[PDB]
Amino acid sequence: PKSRLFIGNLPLKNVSKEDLFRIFSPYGHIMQINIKNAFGFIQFDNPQSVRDAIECESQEMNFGKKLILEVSSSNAR
Numbered sequence: 001p002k003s004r005l006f007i008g009n010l011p012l013k014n015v016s017k018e019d020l021f022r023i024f025s026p027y028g029h030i031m032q033i034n035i036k037n038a039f040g041f042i043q044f045d046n047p048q049s050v051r052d053a054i055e056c057e058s059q060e061m062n063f064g065k066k067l068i069l070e071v072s073s074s075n076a077r
Contacts, residue, residue, distance in 0.1 A: 001076060002031060003044040008068030010058055011040035028053040039068070047073040 005028075011020075017033050020042055024030055028049030034041040044050045054069040062068055 001045055001047075002074060003047045003050045004070075004072035004074065005042045005044050005050045005053055006068070006070035006072065007040045007042070007054065007058060009038060009066065011035055012038055015040065023057060024053045027056055047071060 015035060020033065020040075021030060024042075029045035030049075031043040031045050034043070044053065050073075051071045054071065058069050059067050
């Protein structure tokens, strides 16, 4: 499937597709990248795999102007 992962304040160190692929590979099933600014977006396979990625690698709760994440899904086809 397709799915959507959002990150703030973590992807500020240098990153390319393999870096996020290997750090998230055991947490979730992954698809494609889109990173810019003090933030980064990654499309994934499966939305449970999205929430296990940012809630176990980043943090299981957000904090204003300090650590931001989001889980997001979409309709198939």
